[PDB]
Symmetry: none
Subunit: 74 residues, 10 copies
Amino acid sequence: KVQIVYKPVDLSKVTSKCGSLGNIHHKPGGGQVEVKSEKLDFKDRVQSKIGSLDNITHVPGGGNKKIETHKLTF
Amino acid sequence: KVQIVYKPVDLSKVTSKCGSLGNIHHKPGGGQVEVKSEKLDFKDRVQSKIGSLDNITHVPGGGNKKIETHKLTF
Amino acid sequence: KVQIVYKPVDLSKVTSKCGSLGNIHHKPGGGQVEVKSEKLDFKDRVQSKIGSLDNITHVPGGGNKKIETHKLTF
Amino acid sequence: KVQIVYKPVDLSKVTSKCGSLGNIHHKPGGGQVEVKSEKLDFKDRVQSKIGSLDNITHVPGGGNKKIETHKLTF
Amino acid sequence: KVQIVYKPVDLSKVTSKCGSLGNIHHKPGGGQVEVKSEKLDFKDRVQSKIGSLDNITHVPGGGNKKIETHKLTF
Amino acid sequence: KVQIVYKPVDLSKVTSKCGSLGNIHHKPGGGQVEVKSEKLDFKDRVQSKIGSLDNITHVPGGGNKKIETHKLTF
Amino acid sequence: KVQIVYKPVDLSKVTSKCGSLGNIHHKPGGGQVEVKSEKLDFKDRVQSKIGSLDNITHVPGGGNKKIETHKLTF
Amino acid sequence: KVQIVYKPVDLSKVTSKCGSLGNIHHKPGGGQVEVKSEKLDFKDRVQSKIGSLDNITHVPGGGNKKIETHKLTF
Amino acid sequence: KVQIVYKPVDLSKVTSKCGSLGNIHHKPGGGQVEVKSEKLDFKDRVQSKIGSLDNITHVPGGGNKKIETHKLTF
Amino acid sequence: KVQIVYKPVDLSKVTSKCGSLGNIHHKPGGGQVEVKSEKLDFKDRVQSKIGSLDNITHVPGGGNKKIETHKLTF
């Protein structure tokens, strides 16, 4: 006889307050990416990024995160 | 006899407040991406990004996230 | 006879307050990335980033995180 | 007969307050990355970053973290 | 007969207050990274960073951390 | 050339919570009021209360009040 | 050239919590008020209360108050 | 050339918590008030209270108050 | 050229906590007030209270108060 | 050229905690007040209280007070 009770309780908070957010300047000089290759052989669950240039501005009013995993294996 | 009870309880909060958000300038210089190759062989669940240039501005009023996974395997 | 009770309790807080956030300048000089290769053989759960240049500005009003994992194996 | 009770209790806080945050200047000179190779053989859960240049500005209003792991193995 | 009770209690705080944070200048001269190789053979849970140049400015309003691990093995 | 920008931001709150409010007894003994004169001569925006015996019970579930005035004169 | 920018930010709160409020007894003995004169001559914005016996019970669940005035004169 | 920037930030709070409030007894003995004159001559913004016997019970769950004034004169 | 920047930051608090507030007894003996004159001549912003017997019980769960004034004169 | 920067920062607090507040007895013997004159002549911003017998009980759960004044004159 096996009895398993799984009842975690979560009443947590992840929060923020901000009066004013601003005057943000993202102005990098432009750059160069040069990639030289001959043969590309990609097999079986392969993930790739080749030859990439990017500029990202991310300014959320709050970007709080809560990540939660629950796993029960019997 | 096996008895499994799975009843997690979640009353959490992920929140934010922002008075004012703004005056955000994304003005990078333009760049260059150059990719040279000959043979591209991509097989079996392969994901790729080749030769890419991008500019992303992301300014949510709040971009809070809650990610939750529940898995029970018997 | 096996009896397992799993009932962790979480009433925690991850929080922040900020009056004013701003006057942030991201203005790096542009750079160069040059990659030379011949043969790329990527197999079986391989992840890669080759030849990459990037500029990221990340200014959340608060970016608090709560990461939680619960695992029960029987 | 085996009886296991797992009931940890967490009422903790991770918090911060900041009056004013700002006047942050990220202005590095541009640099160069040059990578020369011939054969790239990547197999079985391999993760790589080759030939990379980056500039990151990260200025959260608070970026407090709480990381928690709960594992019960029977 | 085995009876195990696991009930740790945590009411701790990790906190900070800061009146004013600012006037931070990150302005390194640009540098150079040059890597020369021929054969790259990476197998079985291998993680690598080759040929890398980076500039990171990290200025949180508070970046307090609480890391906690709970493990019970029977 | 005159430019006036009036853009105040208000995300405030005035609030209350009360579990239970009650068993309030207003039972003053009766009294007497006597006012005597020969002539009343009232002119030009006169406000008056003469000879009064009022009994008032005021028990709101909350009587939170917010008064806000915005005036711009040019 | 005159430029006026008026942009105050208010994320404040006035609040209260009360578990239980009660068993309040207002039971003053009755009294007497006597006011005598021959003539009342009131002119130009006169406000008056003459000869009064008031009994007031005021028991709000919270009577939190916020008064805010913003005035810009040019 | 005149530039005026008025941008105060307020993230303050006025608060209270009370478990239980009560068993308040207002039971003054009744008294007497006698006021006598022959003539009242009131002019130009006169405010007055003459001959009074008031009994006031004021028991808020919280009577927290916040008064704020912002004035800009040019 | 005149530049005025007014940007004060307020993250303050005025607060109180009280477990229990009560068993307050206001039971003064009744008294007497007698005021006599022949003429009252009040002019130009006169404020007065003549002949009074007031009984006041004031028992807030908290009567925390915050008064703030901001004045900019140019 | 005149540049004035007014940016004070306030992260202060005025607070109190009280376990229990009570058993307060206000029971003065009744008394008498007699005021006599023939004429009252009050002019131009006169504030007065004549002939009074007040009984006041004031028992807040906390009556913490914060008064703040900011004045900039140019």
